[PDB]
Structures are given as structure tokens and as C-alpha cells.
Design a protein around this ligand. Sequence first.
Ligand SMILES: [Zn+2]
Lengths: 81, 151, 129, 155, 87, 184
Amino acid sequence: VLVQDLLHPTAASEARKHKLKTLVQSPRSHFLDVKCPGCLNITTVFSHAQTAVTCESCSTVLCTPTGGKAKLSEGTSFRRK
Amino acid sequence: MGRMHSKGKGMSSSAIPYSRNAPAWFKGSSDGVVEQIIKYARKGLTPSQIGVLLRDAHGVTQAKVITGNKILRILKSNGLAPEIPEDLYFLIKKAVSVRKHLERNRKDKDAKFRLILIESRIHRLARYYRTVSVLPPNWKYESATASALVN
Amino acid sequence: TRTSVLADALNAINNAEKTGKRQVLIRPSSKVIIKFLQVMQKHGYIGEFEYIDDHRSGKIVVQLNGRLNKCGVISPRFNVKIADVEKWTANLLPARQFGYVILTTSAGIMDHEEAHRKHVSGKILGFVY
Amino acid sequence: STELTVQSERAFQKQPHIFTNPKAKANRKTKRWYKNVGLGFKTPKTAIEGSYIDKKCPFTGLVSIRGKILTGTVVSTRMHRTIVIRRDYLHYVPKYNRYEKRHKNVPAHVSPAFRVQVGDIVTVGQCRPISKTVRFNVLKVASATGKANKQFAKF
Amino acid sequence: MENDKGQLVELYVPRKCSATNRIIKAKDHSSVQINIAQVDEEGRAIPGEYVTYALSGYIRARGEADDSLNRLAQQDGLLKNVWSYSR
Amino acid sequence: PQAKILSQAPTELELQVAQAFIDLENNSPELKADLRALQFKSIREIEVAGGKKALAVFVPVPSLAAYHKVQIKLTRELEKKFQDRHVIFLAERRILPKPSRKSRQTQKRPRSRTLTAVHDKILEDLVFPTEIVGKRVRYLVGGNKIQKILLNSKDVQHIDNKLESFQAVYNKLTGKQIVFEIPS
RNA sequence: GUCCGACUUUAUGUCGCGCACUGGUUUUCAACCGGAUCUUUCCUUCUGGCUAACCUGUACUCCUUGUGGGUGCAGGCGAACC
Ligand SMILES: [Zn+2]
């Protein structure tokens, strides 16, 4: 109060403000690199995808929709992009 | 948070990041993305559906950031844009659903309320798309041209 | 629907200044706001402010130095003659000694004395004192 | 306009005191006197080679343009061989320091040498008293379409 | 302020709030004045020589005078790492 | 093969830079198959305070995409050969002014042909290997504009000392002064 | 420079309002109004005057080598005006 560096605020402060109230509109979604149990066809998967995605090479559900981020199909493995 | 047809005041939306250029990690190039887009369009898929599929099944964040241009305009480039934008089309379809409900049963006077609200939305979009030279001005809308076009 | 962007900007400025906030956040951040603020600073009524880009209209962060007592817009940009400006003076400026009704003319956004010594009159924007 | 063989009504249409010579070994159809009004106006092409009469044409007719010049918007084309132009402008009522968008509609005369659609933007000029409604007369249509010069989408 | 001759006719040039850069009332019996005694290198009192901070009671009313005092104390090089420019 | 890669030949400095590019063309097996379609557009030097200099090559913005594709190795080799020199790969611009009310409508100017467009793009490609993350500007009490620029902390090590050269080149480009800042 | 009030019938050195009336403005000063301009910077430009004018260039010279100074006549600045 009565002074802030709202041009240079604490990073955790933006981190704890959700979307559109940051200095720059900074989405929190990201990507993941995902390995399917069946085939080694490495793929990229959106954080908050909607469609029940199956691998393009072979049909096997990988991620399942929710209100928020879509659940993985519990079978695959992931790493940060 | 305008929200004509209710008292809604929700700003729930999606905020684009800062980079209008493609992200560093991405490997595909614009032309291949365009060919994927046009093949998807020839499947008979509405542009918003194809945008969602590009975002999910691939690292296609923005059509414009990757291929330098947006989906509808590209689909116009190859002479394959549908006659009606997906927005007005889906609204007309929902209006047809409402109409079939009200013809099936009568006492849904509150459904008459929804009907007038929706058809007001159609009137708004009709004025807009007449001004901006998308539809020819000759186009009107009562009940049955919807039945022919949608069905 | 944000109608007059500079109106909202100065309204926030005045609100915080009354509250005492040494700084203000302005959402729309248009050219008119910017030029109003260089007039603001050149007269000495405000400190150093900053512009943020968004690829959408940016943002404004103005540092309050307390010297301001009020901003204020005249949202109907009433059409003013060269002689009439003085009356606006006696109706908005706290005294004839100082105080600056800001008006936009073909030359640009200026203080009223700037316009008078240029002998040019345009349309009215607001006031500072 | 006069619609497809001007020589239609119960009387002939001839630009007065111009003699179509049958004694000339020429077979030149007719002598169509023509003239430029001036003021930086260009007489349109279709007027020189036309066949119509339009005694009230500024170019091929008898009327002489002089006085006021105005700009307006076509509002009604139904009337035969004439036109009505709406003029929308602002009026400063002094009590409130405000302007006022009101309209005044004025009839003018169109030569067949012009093609007019509703909503076109036209320069009009002053002339002799032509009719109790018409005291002005068109010169030329700048905005021939407004936005409709391109209508197809075939890339 | 000044006369035509060039004399300061005005009585009472006012004080200005060291916190919010604002004038101080004469009747508003809430203005606060803080005397900060200078301390020598060796740990003694230095009476007579000491700095002053005149803070308007407005901050005593809104309730943020604490941050103001911390601000002025840290900035003036008398106090260490209590106040932050970015919170 | 100099005469084909400059299009007009005054100012021998440009031809010696072309000679250095040809020397780059010497190492074929990987530094070729792309370097054939490279050209110069009246290269100009840029002075820098302190003694250093910053080279400014210009591109007809045709396949500048291929340049930025194979850029970094060319950049470093040009630095190694032209010692004490910092080359900047500008996009040469034929920028257009605004239509004045007095001036006659002259085929309405696309915004790509605007001062803002050229200046923003030239900043965006001034430090190519890393994207600028943000733009700021301040307006001093004296009445002078200062644009502040925020570049990614990630991928900064590829320049790490040429910010002064960037300030110099762009200030002499337009007079709009520049001071960078890096987030943590 | 012109000079004005202290000094009284008349006048000056001297003290003073540090110019009461007029300039150079590089006295650094500050402006603030334009104007030319280099901006990748248009302020519409031609078709002809008339060429205003001097990159002109012809004799090169009235002349102290020296651009201190100009009559002159096809290219060629028009913007000085038609
Ligand atoms: Zn698979």
C-alpha cells in the first residue's frame, strides 16, 4: 500500500494471481511430451485438451476430458515440455 | 461481462501469450500445417472444430502464429469457406431445435421466451453480416429457409 | 463498455490521489491518455509514468507525486471558440492564477495557455489543477 | 432514361433548332449538339454518343447550370427521369452547445446519360426552375457502388 | 505568494506531509510529528541534532502510516532492510 | 563472384564483406547448399562509442527467413573474420510515410509500410537468437522518451556483451534511445 | 548613446530608478511562434510561360593574385510568380 513496484512485482505474486490480472496476459497452460504404452510414437499433448485423444498411429485413449485439465488415461508417461 | 441474454458478469476467457512468432521448440513448418488444415476442412469440419483439433492433437497453438494467417481466411484462400459462418449456423440449428420443441408441445411459454431471445441474436448477426458484405443483403430469415439450409 | 478511455483513466487517477495511492493503473492506455499525460508531467503536476505493451492497447502505470489535487474530463467535447476558452477557465480552474484546462486542437492536445499564445482553438478535453 | 427507343410518346424529340440534313450525302444519323457545364465538371461519355433528348439535361438539354453546388445522397429513384436526394447535416442549437442531424430532401433531374441506384452519393447543381419540386439537377455520380464493386469470392 | 514589490506577504508557509506529500492542517488535531535522534558512531545520544518527519494524520486515519514510516526510514539511509519498493 | 551478390558496387567496404561471405562459401560440405542465394543491399557501417564498431548488412526482406534460419554460424564466422566487428542482419526497408489530408489518396498505405512496423520488426530482429519478452516506455520530466526493452533471460548467453552496440545502432537508426533490462 | 531624479535663480564630475528613448541579439541566455530543411520523410504534379534566378557555360573580364564581383547566350533549379 501507498507504494508498489507493480511494474516489477514479486514473481510469486503474479504466480498467485490468475489470468488477465497480470501485467501481461500470461497463460498458465503448457505442453507435455508423452510416451504411449503401446507404441514408442512420441507425441505432444496440450495441458488442458478436451478431445479424448488416441494416438494417430494406433487407437488407444491417452487423455480424457474434464472441466479443467483433461485426465490422462493412466497408462502413458509424461515429461515437461 | 456484458452478456445480453442474462445477468452474467463472468470474464472467464482465454488470454493469448506475448509471442506472435512460433515457439522455439516447435518442429513443423507452415506449409505442412496448411495442408493438414485443408485436409481437415475437406472432411467437412467447422473451422472452430479444426482449431481445437490442431491445438489438441498437435502443437498448433495459433493458426495465425504458425501459418501467418487465421483459419477462416485461409479457408477462403483455397475457395472452400462455407456459405454461412459456423457461428450463425450453430445458432440457426439451436433455433430449429427450439422450434421443433415448441411445435411438439405448446405450454412451454418460457421456451417462447428463449425463442424470442435467440431469434433476436440471429437478427443482430444478420444485420452485422449484411453490413460487412459477407452475406448478400437479399438474405432474410423466418423459419423455413432455416429448415432447408440446416436440414 | 469503456466509452471514454481518458475519462476512466483520470477517474482512477483522482480516486487514488484522494486515497493517497502514490501510483495508478490505467487499463485502456490510448494515445490521447498518453499525450494528456505528457501535458500533465510538463506542467509539473505528476511524476514519471510507464507504458506496458500487451499487443492490445497496452497499460499505464502513473506515479503520483501528490502535487495533483484533481484531474477531470469533459466527456462532451464541447466545441469552443478562441474567446470562449477563458469562460471555461472561470468555470473549471480554481483561480485565474494557475490551473490548466486541456483542449485538443488541430495542433494537438495542449494546455489552454499554449493554445492562446498559439492563437489556435480546437475542442475541449479536460482540466488539471 | 426514357427506356429503349426514346422516340416513344405522341410527339417527336429533337434538340430544338438543330437541323438534321437530308441533303447531305453522308447518312450521318443525327447532329447531337453537346457542351460542357464547367466548374471542373467533366461531361460523361454516354452523353455525347447518346440518342435521347432530355430537354432538361444540363449537357444535351436546354437548361443552363449556375449558382449553388451541393453534395448529397440518392434516397429515391422510383420517379421517372428524375431523382430525390437526401441531405443530412448538423444544426447547432445554441441553448445546449450541440449539433443536430436533420435531413432535407430535394428533387433533381437526371439525364439518361447516368445510372443511379438508391443510396448513391451525387454532386448536384443549381439550375432554372424545372418543376415545383425540381430546381436542382444532377451532374455526376462518384460513389457508383459504395462497397459493391467486388461481390464474388473466386480466388 | 509574492508581492509586486517582491515580498513574501503570505503568512505561514505550510508544512508538507513527509509521507503523502500533502499540506498539514492547523485545526486537525491528528497531525503527528516524529523526532528521530541521530546516533553517533559509538552509541550515545546526540541531543540538539536530530532529524524530523512530519506525517499528516490522514495516514493515521486510513491506517497505513506504518508502511510510510518504514519507507522513509529505509530510503533515508537510517534503517536497514525493513521496507520494500516491491511488495 | 562478387558482382552478383551486391547489385551495385560503390564503397569497397561492402565488397570486402562480400569477400568474407565468399570465404564462408569456401567451406562447402555443410556451409553450402543454402549460401548460394545470399545477396547484399548497400551495406552500411555503424559507429559505436568506445572505439568498437557494429556492421549493418541489409536484406531485401525476400528470403530473410533463410538467413535467420542459418544465421548464427554466419554471425559468429563474420565476427571471427572481421575482428572487433559486430554484424547486424537488418531487414532493409522501403518505408512509406502517412497519407496527409492535403496529399491525394495514393493507394492507401498498408500498415506493414509504417514507422511503427519497421521499428518494431527491426528491434525484434536486432537480437535474433532470443525473442524480446516485453516492451515498456517512460517519459522523463525534461520531456524525453525512453523505450525500455525486456528480453528473455533464457538464451541470453549468445550475446551477453553487445547490448551497448544495440543501443548505439538503434539510437543512430532513429534517435529513439534504448536501454535494455533482463528479468531473472 | 540620449540623457532623467538627488542640487536651490543656470549648468556639470558625484550619488540614484542600474536605461525613464532608441540597437548589436552568438552575452553565454531561456523561450516560444513559424520557415527551411536529412530523415527509408510529399508540402499533388504535370503541360507550357519567364525563366525568377546562377550548377549554368560562353569572351572571361570592369578589377590587387584573390570569387572582393557581372553584361552575356543552346543544355539545364522552376517554385519567385503564371
Ligand atoms: Zn500409437
